[PDB]
Structure formats: C-alpha cells, structure tokens
Design a protein around this nucleic acid. Structure first.
Ligand SMILES: [Zn+2]
Ligand SMILES: [Zn+2]
Lengths: 104, 914, 68, 114
RNA sequence: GACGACACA
RNA sequence: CUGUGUCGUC
C-alpha cells in the first residue's frame, strides 16, 4: 500500500523536472487541479496567502506553461472579478475558489 | 494508312464502325497476359507473353473509350475451320462472344485471321491471376479491374494501405462489388456447359477463354461427335475460379426474392434448418456439371477427400441461408414427462446437417455422461437467457446469460525492484546506450476483451481451390508419414497440468481434475464411443491474458470445455506425442534449444541444400484469420492415422465433433454467448500441431504456385519442366491419388526446400539459384498465397531473407543466432533480445513474486537463455549477462556444481550432453 | 537516461492509480491507461514529461495521499 | 466428489428449466415439421427480456430511441437503462450535448410487449 | 512421477 | 488456456 507511494515519491524526487515539482508543490500547499490537465483547467486555492505568488491577471503560471483565467468561481457561486482580491474583504467567503483557465 | 482503315471497316462487319486503332494494324501482341495453358511441353497457370493478339477497341458515345475489345488474331485455316465447326453448334447460348470468323489478306496476299466481338479489355484469367499472385507494388491490372467496373475510384489507391485486410477492411466491399459479375459468369458457364451437352461437344473449358462480361471464346480445343452426348471437361475452370467466389461473394444475390439485387432479402422461415433441397438447387444452378457427386449433407460422403469436396462447396453454399439457422438444433426431449430442450442434431456451415443417433425421448433419469453432454450444450443456456443485441461487435450475438454484461481490466505490471537500482548503478540505462528497456507489461481498460474478440471480424468465409487442396493434402500427409497414430483408450492417455480451467459452465464447480477424477475409465470410453456417433457442441470461455509484449495490444486466450478436451486427447495423444518425440523431421516440435539442440536443428535445416539462402515469415493474425477449410484440412490430416481403429462414419462424427467444439462453437466473451466465425481456439488440445499442418500447407501451396506460375519455356533444367507438367496434371487431372508423383514432389521439396516448422514460426533453407529462377517459392510467393488463401497481407518488414550462412537465422522463435567458437568447434548459439531480457528481469507479473524469499530461480532462468550475449562482439551485450551474474551473486549473498555465482553453468547448457 | 526512469515511474504511477480503486470508472480509467500506454510507447523526453504530469494531476485530483 | 457435482449439474438444469418450460416455447416447437428447430431462434423468439449493449450515442439514436423499439419483430418497452458503471441513467440524461459526460457503453433492458 | 518457476509457439 | 524445453524437493 504505502510502499508503492513511497517508491513513487522517491523516484519522482529523482527525475527532477520543472513542471513535475511545480505540480507537487502546488498540491502540497493546497492547489489541487479539479480535473485532468488537458493538452480548460480548474484549480482550487484553499487560501490567499499562497496565491499572490502564482497568478496575476490574465497570466497564470502552472504546468510550466501559461494559463489564462476566463471566470472565477467562489464557494457561494458568484463571479469574483479578479480585482476583488484585497487585504480587507478577504474573510467574507469560504477560501476554495475555482479558477477556470485556458491555454495559449 | 488506307490498309489500316480497310482493316477497321473489315473487322467491323456488323458491330459499330467506331473502333480505335489500339496498337497498330499489325498484331499489337500486348505483353504479359496471364494464360492457363497445358500441352505436352508447357503446363501451369502462368503469365506468358502473348504474341498473336491485336486488342482493338471500340469507343462509346461522346468519343469516350469503353470496356470492350475485339481481339483480332492471325489464326490459321485449320484451327479456324475447327472453331467455326464448334461455334455453329453453340451460336445459340448466351455465353458465346460472337467470334465473327472471316477472311482478308494481311500480308499483301492470302492470309486468314479472326476478329472477336465485345469480350472485354481484361480477362477472367487476369482477374483470378491478379487476385492470387498479389504484389503490393506491381498490381497494375488490379487497380483497373476495380476501377473500370464502377467498384471504386482511382483516388482510393493513393490512400496508402488500400490493399490490406486487417487494416482498411473496406477493400472487402470494393471487391464484393464484383459479385454480380462473377455470378453472371457462373450462370453463363452453366448455360454453356448444358448447351454443349445438349448439342454434343466434348472438350475442355479454361479460364482465359472467358471474359469479365461473361462471354466465352477460343473454341478450338474442342472436338465434334454425335450431337447430344458431348461432355465438357470443366474441372480447371471451376477449380481455379473457386478461391474468388468467396472473395467477391458471387452468391450475394440468392438471398433475394427473384435473385436480383433490388428486391428485399428473403423473409426466410425461422423454423427451417434443412436447406438440403435449396442446396441441391444451388448446385444444379451454378455447378450443374461439376463432374463429381456432391452430397448436400456431408454424412453421405465416401472418404476424407469427398469430405473436403462437399465441405468446400458448402462453405460457399451456406453464405446464403440465414445465420439464424446454423449452430445446434434442438428438440423437446422429455425427462420424467418434463420438456428438456437439448441438441438432437447440428447444422454446420460446411459439413451440412448432421443428426445424432443415441437420442431418445422419455428417459427415466440421467447418468454422468448424459448430464455432461446435456449441461455442455449451448441449448439449455441460450434457451433461457435474455436475448442480446451487442452493438460493440459484429459477431452474431445469441443470449446474455446473466442480467448485466461484465467488463474486466488489465492491471499494469510491477516495476523497479532492486534489479533496476543495480542496473542503473552498473553503468547501464545511461544516455543513449546500445540497449534500452523496451519490453513492458502494458495495461488495458474494461472495454478490451470484447474489442479484442472482435478481431474475429477478419475471419471470412473462404472457398479454397479444391483440386489443388486435394493434392496439397497428400503432400502434407507425406510430410507426416514417420509418425504413428490412432485412437487410444482411457488408461493410455497422459494429462499434464491437471489443474487448469475446465471451461464454461464446468468452471463453476472445479478444475479439470474434478471431472477427470469423478469419471471412471469405462464412463470416459463410453462418452468417447457416444461422441464417435453423436455431435456435441460446447462453450469456450474467452478471457484476457497477462504477459509482457513490445506492443500495447491485448492477448485473449480461450479455454475450451472439459468434455471436448477429454475426448480430443484420447483421439490425438498418440500422434501428438509421436510428433513431439521425434527429431530430424520437418515439423520440429518437442526439440530442445539446449545441449546442442539449436546447432543440430540448424545443421538439419542446412542438410544438403546446394546454394542456400535462408528465409522466414509470419502470418498476421494467424489464429484470427485461418480459414475454416484449412482448419478442416488440418483436422483431416491429423485424423488420417486412424485406419484400423474407426470406420468412416465414426471418423466423420469425430471431425464434426471437433468442428462444433473448437472451430465454430459458442464463445462466452464476458457474460453472453457469441457465434465464433472460425479460427483456432487457443485452448485447443491440438492447436500447436494444426498450426504446423497449416504451415506446411501454406508452404507447399507457395511452392506449387511458384512452380506452376513460372514460365515453363524458361526453365533451363530438363527435369523440372517434366515435374511441373506432372504437377499440373496431378492437380487438375487424374482425380485419383498418384503416389508416384506425390513421392517425387515431396523428394524435390526436401532436396530444395528444407523447412523447419515449429507452430506458426518457420525458417527455410532454399536453393537460392532455384528461388531466383522461379523453381521454388519466395516471400513474393508467400505474400500472394496468404492474400488469396488466409485473407491477410504479409508485410515484407517482418520477413527476413539472409544472404549468408555463417550468421544464422535472423530470428527463429524470437531468438537470434550467432556462430560461436567452442574450442575449435564452431557451433551456433541462440541468443535473445537484450531489451526483452532486461525487461523480464526488471519487471514481474504481479507483486507476490518479488525476488525476496527463494525466487533467485527466476533470475537464473534468464541467464540460462541470455548466456550467448557474453560472446557477442558488442561489449554491452556481454555486459548484460555479466550484470545479470553479478546481481545474481549479490542476491545469493543477501539470501546467504549448481552454484549460480560462477559462469560454469550457462557454458554447459550449450555444449552437447557428451 | 531520462526515458527509462520516466517509463518506469509512469508504470508505478498507473499501479498506484489502480491501487486506489480508480478502476471503478470508464472515462477516468480509459484516459489513465491511454496516458500510460502513450508514455511507454514514447521515445521523446518531453511528451513523456507532459503525460507524466497529467497522470500526477489525476493522482492529486483525489485525496488519497498529499504530504506523507 | 461425485454426488456434489452431479447434484450441481442437475439442479442447474432443473433451475434454468423453470424459465424454460413456458408455453411460448411449446408453441414454437408445436409448429416445426419434426419437433426440431435451430437454437439461434429460441431466445430470439421466446426470451421475455432484451439486453442491448450500446457503445456511444450514434448507435443509441438509431437502436433504442424513444421508449418502444422493435428488435426481433416485436415491441419492446424500455426499463432500467444503465451505463458501464452499473449506474442507472434516466432517459433524459441521454442527450447529444451530455453524451460526452456519461460512460460510453450502456446496457438498455427491455421487456417483451404483448 | 507430484508441486513451483522461467522461456517459446 | 493448449502444449513444448529448462531449473528447484521427496
Ligand atoms: Zn462427398
Ligand atoms: Zn480413430
């Protein structure tokens, strides 16, 4: 059970690829892709202190490629426009926010 | 000039006066028209160079050339008068191109000549030829037959792979678009044969004397007698035409109301199974003159040759009747006054209708053998199961047994034990190495077993050439003389792996050991006697297998029931054990690549060939494609050893049992029965030897069609010409058997074609000069034989011709061969692909077999077959086995002369025993 | 040398995927096995990386293991 | 070792005989010429429930549209349409736009409508 | 011969 | 699943 997961994590920390560790770090600090990354992506961000570093406007750094949000979703299903994120109106929602991006 | 215009207006006569000067006024003698000639000098079905033709052509309206030629020849007065005197008899039937005999002076003075009427451009002989001798890059008169007859378009060929079968199967439709034309040809040949009989014309009918429009011509080989008596010798025509009657489906229009291709399909009665009167009418309509008694059923035959004949006819005659009438027949057998529905007969697609004989209503109880034969039929299973319509496949669905179909997934194999840490430690698997791990345990999703079983869609109805098969069988049985056979009793049988799957439904209660131990010897022998008089259909559970491969395809293995294998073993064990226990023959099964085995095998293949060059081949989808007639041929060749033990009726019931049990039986893929169109069920008891028989059949057929289709006027030898003469004569004349020439041809093959045939994979050592002069077969003669007999296409990227002898076979049984030196004894060594070896080492089937407890014996059996890598000049090949031995020693250490730490073990497994 | 380890880690990825009863669906398991097959049959170092990170996205879409 | 398997086969036969000793089968065998009919017609004519496997939406459209479709020359009323996950699928959820959202192989089950 | 394993078809 | 060969105990 845990032996396969252990071997997988070791020989993932042995490959040492950029997008690989990117995905692993984002999954470590909360960012989980709600579906399978196509080659239309959805990710959850359980906080905001670890979000300022990844996305900025139409630019979205994930999977070592560029992404671009089209509409943001919150817990209560409202379209949070991307200038609502501030240090004052932050705790007015449940932190899982769906980000719907697209490729180049 | 004016002479040419006079020639045109003179060849016209009564037809349209708008012919085109194709070629020249003189004989255009168009090259390379495949003839079918037989005289005292030359014989065969070859492609001689025509010299007398002058293929003029009329143009249709709007100045467009049309498919109609007038073949103006330069005949002499003798044959001219002969043809006129045998054409005035036949000028009334339809199948006579209006020869239009006349005269002129084409030399300046006094020269006679003939001028045909509206035959075609290309001939029926060309159709049959270009369909048989198929070349992937030379088929020019096959991209025109398909086009000039509205069957397809020109740009269909710019699509690469346009000709294949196992990929792009729409070519089946493009070919079948000629079915109406071939059926008109059959009709017209019958209205000609009967017009000759009823008019007294004795002679012969050949292929190149017909034409695609149905017309006939060249009425010179006849001779006149008292009218009303003359019979035409029509063996050659029908024989050479047969193999394309099921490639174009010339009987796709008998399933209609008034036998035309516009009315709705016959609303056949659901409860009709006999069809024997319709079979007799089919024969009286299409083969009214095929001069041998054809029995609709096959139970009324006379010997295995009559069985081949009648079954080969029925395998085409039963593509008309609805598929909802084949398979078992059922009856309301009463038990205690309770209606059972079990099988009281069987309707075969080839063997006709066969009825049981130990059937009896009003039984007071049932015994063990009766319960077995009852619970083994598909009758009680498909009579109470939900009707099924499976849209995932094409095979005729029968009855879903359970209430929900079942999907099964293919797990992925384990990987990366410490035998990959060590492999990457000891300088392997680095940047672009000579070897790279390229053998994995691939995985498949749920929808895999059914999509793989669907590969029976390449199995088609095939009508083999019967006058040629009835000689290839004799040559094969000559290949099988040195083996003893015959039925054995229960006590004399030997069973290995008594704990495998016992088939459906028998796998619901135990393994084959359960039944073999429950049944007594008398009961097994009585079941055998019963099956020698009665037909028992059974069910084969087809499930997925789990092995390593270099592709990602799935591997579905089938397991036949136990009441089938239990009798097939008693039937065939003697002959199979005898094939296995003999060395030095053609069929090499039961050999041993260790202890000089490879070396002795390769020497025996090099036995005494004069100018040798090796060869090899592989049949794509061999099991999914092997036609039912060739499988029946293999069954009969295996059964030929029974001559003092079972009568003809017993042996026919055994052949029908074998067919109904393994050839076209009920296959349960998932949770629902299906109709298996044919092929070889992997779980068959005799499949590894039926494949050998089929292998020899294909090779001998390639030799026959390489020795006949060669221009006998260009054979420098003075003996091969006569051997080919007598070959064609024993093929299409002399309905009896000719042991003299069969012996002599088998000797010719053994002296110039040294086969080496383990099931489905062979290597040959042919005389290169002969295989270059066309006296024996090549890959160009195996590809064609496959394309017209097995209905596949053998790509030349998996067939290797080795122009050297020092380096051995490129690949036999997946092993390579490297001529090595064992102390001034230069011998041959079998060495495998190091990628495959490293893959087998690293991975493992499932995770209970990690080499941790006592499993070093897994790693020793890899260096036992990967030793000769150490003798390869490439240093990395040697380092493969050296790494193997190093980590085997490390395994032996961490686990703390058969000690597997020194290489004095693998060195012994290749030097002879003493 | 960045293709053999990639193929083997893709194999162990599909193994740990099935180990979570992911084989109880049609679309998900079909796409996962297609990824694994197209990784194994690959030679390029980049396409294998992309299909690997897609398999890892699959593995992290659930919540079976996050931070050991 | 022997009584067990004999009883197994016997009760299996007499159990699949419960749904086999009906009157439709006796009717179709009372019409044959010699009490002998082919096997491939027995389920096709007397089985009282249909099971059709369907790989995608295009075959569904022209095989199992509406609620009453005709296979084997009879009316069939559809009940309990299910997909590859053994999950019930309503007749509304089978739409062209939603067809890429459900499992590919369906299993539609009908009953012989008299 | 009984069992297990590996390889080939 | 059908076999063929090669290794390990009693
Ligand atoms: Zn006969
Ligand atoms: Zn016999």
């Amino acid at each position: 059970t845990s032996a396969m997961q252990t071997m997988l994590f070791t020989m993932l920390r042995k490959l040492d690829n950029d997008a690989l560790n990117n995905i692993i770090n984002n999954a470590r600090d909360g960012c989980v892709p709600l579906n399978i990354i196509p080659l239309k992506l959805m990710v959850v961000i359980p906080d905001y202190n670890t979000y300022k570093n990844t996305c900025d406007g139409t630019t979205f750094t994930y999977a070592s490629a560029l992404w671009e949000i089209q509409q943001v979703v919150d817990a209560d299903s409202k379209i949070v426009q991307l200038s609502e994120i501030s240090m004052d109106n932050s705790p007015n929602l449940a932190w899982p926010l769906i980000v719907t991006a697209l490729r180049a | 000039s004016a002479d040419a215009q006079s020639f045109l207006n003179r060849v016209c006569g009564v037809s349209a006066a708008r012919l085109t000067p194709c070629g020249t006024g003189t004989s255009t003698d168009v090259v390379y028209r495949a003839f079918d000639i037989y005289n005292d000098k030359v014989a065969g079905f070859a492609k001689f160079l025509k010299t007398n033709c002058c293929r003029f052509q009329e143009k249709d309206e709007d100045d467009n050339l049309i498919d109609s030629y007038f073949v103006v020849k330069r005949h002499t007065f003798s044959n001219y008068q002969h043809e006129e005197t045998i054409y005035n008899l036949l000028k009334d039937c339809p199948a006579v191109a209006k020869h239009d005999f006349f005269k002129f002076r084409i030399d300046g003075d006094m020269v006679p000549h003939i001028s045909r009427q509206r035959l075609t451009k290309y001939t029926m002989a060309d159709l049959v030829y270009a369909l048989r001798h198929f070349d992937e890059g030379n088929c020019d008169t096959l991209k025109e037959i398909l086009v000039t007859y509205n069957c397809c378009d020109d740009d269909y060929f710019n699509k690469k792979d346009w000709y294949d079968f196992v990929e792009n199967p729409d070519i089946l439709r493009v070919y079948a678009n000629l079915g109406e034309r071939v059926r008109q040809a059959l009709l017209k040949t019958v209205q000609f044969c009967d017009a000759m009989r009823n008019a007294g014309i004795v002679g012969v009918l050949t292929l190149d004397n017909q034409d695609l429009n149905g017309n006939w011509y060249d009425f010179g080989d006849f001779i006149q007698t008292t009218p009303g008596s003359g019979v035409p010798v029509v063996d050659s025509y029908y024989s050479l035409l047969m193999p394309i009657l099921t490639l174009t489906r010339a009987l796709t229009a008998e399933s209609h109301v008034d036998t035309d291709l516009t009315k709705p399909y016959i609303k056949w009665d659901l409860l009709k199974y006999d069809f024997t009167e319709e079979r007799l009418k089919l024969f009286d309509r299409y083969f009214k003159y095929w001069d041998q008694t054809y029995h609709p059923n096959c139970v009324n035959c006379l010997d295995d040759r009559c069985i081949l004949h009648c079954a080969n006819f029925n395998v085409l005659f039963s593509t008309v009747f609805p598929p909802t009438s084949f398979g078992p027949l059922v009856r309301k057998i009463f038990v205690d006054g309770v209606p059972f529905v079990v099988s009281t007969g069987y309707h075969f697609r080839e063997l006709g209708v066969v009825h049981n004989q130990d059937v009896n209503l009003h039984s007071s109880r049932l015994s063990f053998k009766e319960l077995l034969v009852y619970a083994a039929d598909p009758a009680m299973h498909a009579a109470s199961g939900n009707l099924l319509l499976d849209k995932r496949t094409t095979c005729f669905s029968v009855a879903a047994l359970t209430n929900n179909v079942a999907f099964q997934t293919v797990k992925p194999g384990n990987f990366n034990k410490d035998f990959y840490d060590f492999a990457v430690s000891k300088g392997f698997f680095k940047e672009g190495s000579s070897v790279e791990l390229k053998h994995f345990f691939f995985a498949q999703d749920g929808n895999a077993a059914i999509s793989d079983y669907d590969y029976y869609r390449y199995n088609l109805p095939t009508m083999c050439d019967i006058r040629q098969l009835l000689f290839v069988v004799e040559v094969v049985d000559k290949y099988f003389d040195c083996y003893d056979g015959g039925c054995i009793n229960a006590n004399q049988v030997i069973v290995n792996n008594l704990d495998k799957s016992a088939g459906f439904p028998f796998n619901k209660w135990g393994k084959a050991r359960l039944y073999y131990d429950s049944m007594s010897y008398e009961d097994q022998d009585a079941l055998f006697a019963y099956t020698k008089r009665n037909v028992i259909p059974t069910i084969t559970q087809m499930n997925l297998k789990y092995a390593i491969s270099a592709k990602n395809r799935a591997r579905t293995v089938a397991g036949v029931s136990i009441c089938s294998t239990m009798t097939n073993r008693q039937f065939h064990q003697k002959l199979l054990k005898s094939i296995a226990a003999t060395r030095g023959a053609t069929v090499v099964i039961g050999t041993s690549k260790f202890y000089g085995g490879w070396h002795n095998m390769l020497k025996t293949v090099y036995s005494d060939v004069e100018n040798p060059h090796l060869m090899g081949w592989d049949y794509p989808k061999c099991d999914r494609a092997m036609p039912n007639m060739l499988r029946i041929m293999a069954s009969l060749v295996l059964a030929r050893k029974h001559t003092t033990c079972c009568s003809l009726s017993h042996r026919f019931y055994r052949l029908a049992n074998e067919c109904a049990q393994v050839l076209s039986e009920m296959v349960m893929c998932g949770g629902s029965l299906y109709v298996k169109p044919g092929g070889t069920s992997s779980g068959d008891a005799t499949t590894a030897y039926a494949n050998s028989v089929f292998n020899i059949c294909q090779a001998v057929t390639a030799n026959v069609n390489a020795l006949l289709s060669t221009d006998g006027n260009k054979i420098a030898d003075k003996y091969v010409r006569n051997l080919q003469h007598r070959l064609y004569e024993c093929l299409y004349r002399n309905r009896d058997v000719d042991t003299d020439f069969v012996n002599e041809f088998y000797a010719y093959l053994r002296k110039h074609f040294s086969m080496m045939i383990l099931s489905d994979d062979a290597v040959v050592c042919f005389n290169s000069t002969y295989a270059s002069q066309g006296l024996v077969a090549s890959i160009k003669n195996f590809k064609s034989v496959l394309y017209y007999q097995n209905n596949v296409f053998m790509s030349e990227a998996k067939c290797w011709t080795e122009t050297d002898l020092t380096k051995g076979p490129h690949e036999f049984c997946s092993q390579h061969t490297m001529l090595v030196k064992q102390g001034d004894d230069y011998v041959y060594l079998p060495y495998p692909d190091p990628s495959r070896i490293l893959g087998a080492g690293c991975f493992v089937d499932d995770i209970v077999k990690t080499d941790g407890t006592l499993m070093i014996e897994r790693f020793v059996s890899l260096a036992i077959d990967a030793y000769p890598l150490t003798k390869h000049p490439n240093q990395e090949y040697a380092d493969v086995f050296h790494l193997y031995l190093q980590y085997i020693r490390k395994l032996h250490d961490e686990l703390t002369t058969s000690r597997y730490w020194e290489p004095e073990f693998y060195e012994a497994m290749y030097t002879p025993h003493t | 040398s960045k293709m053999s380890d990639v193929k083997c880690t893709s194999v162990v990825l599909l193994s740990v995927l099935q180990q979570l009863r992911v084989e109880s669906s049609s679309k998900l398991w079909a796409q996962c096995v297609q990824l694994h097959n197209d990784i194994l049959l690959a030679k390029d170092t980049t396409e294998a990386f992309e299909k690997m990170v897609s398999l890892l996205s699959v593995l992290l879409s659930m919540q079976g293991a996050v931070d050991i």
